[PDB]
Amino acid sequence: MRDIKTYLSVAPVLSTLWFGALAGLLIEINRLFPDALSFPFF
């Protein structure tokens, strides 16, 4: 069990997990606020 977690902590595996989460987040935001050329809140 410990060895599995350690392997999951090596750099490449984190990268896909981290970037994959990042890709999902940006895609969602563009799905809800599309075209987004300016920041018209303030």
Partner 1 sequence: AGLTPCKESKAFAKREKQSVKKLNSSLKKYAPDSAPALAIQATIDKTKRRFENYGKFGLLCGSDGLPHLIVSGDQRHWGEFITPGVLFLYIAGWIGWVGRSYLIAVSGEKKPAMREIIIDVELAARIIPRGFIWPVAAYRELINGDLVVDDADIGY
Residue ranges that bind ligand CLA, judged by CB under 6 A? 30, 35-37
Q: Could you say whether residue 14 binds partner 1 (CB under 8 A)? A: yes
Cβ-Cβ contacts under 8 Å for 19 (sequence gap 6 or more): none
Contact positions with partner 1 (CB under 8 A) in 18-37: 34-35, 37
Residues 4, 10: Cα–Cα separation, whole Å: 10
Residues 28, 17: Cα–Cα separation, whole Å: 17
Among ligand CLA, partner 1, none, what binds residue 11 when CB lies within 5 to 8 Å by partner kind?
A: partner 1
Considering beta carbons, is residue 24 or 36 the nearer one to partner 1? 36
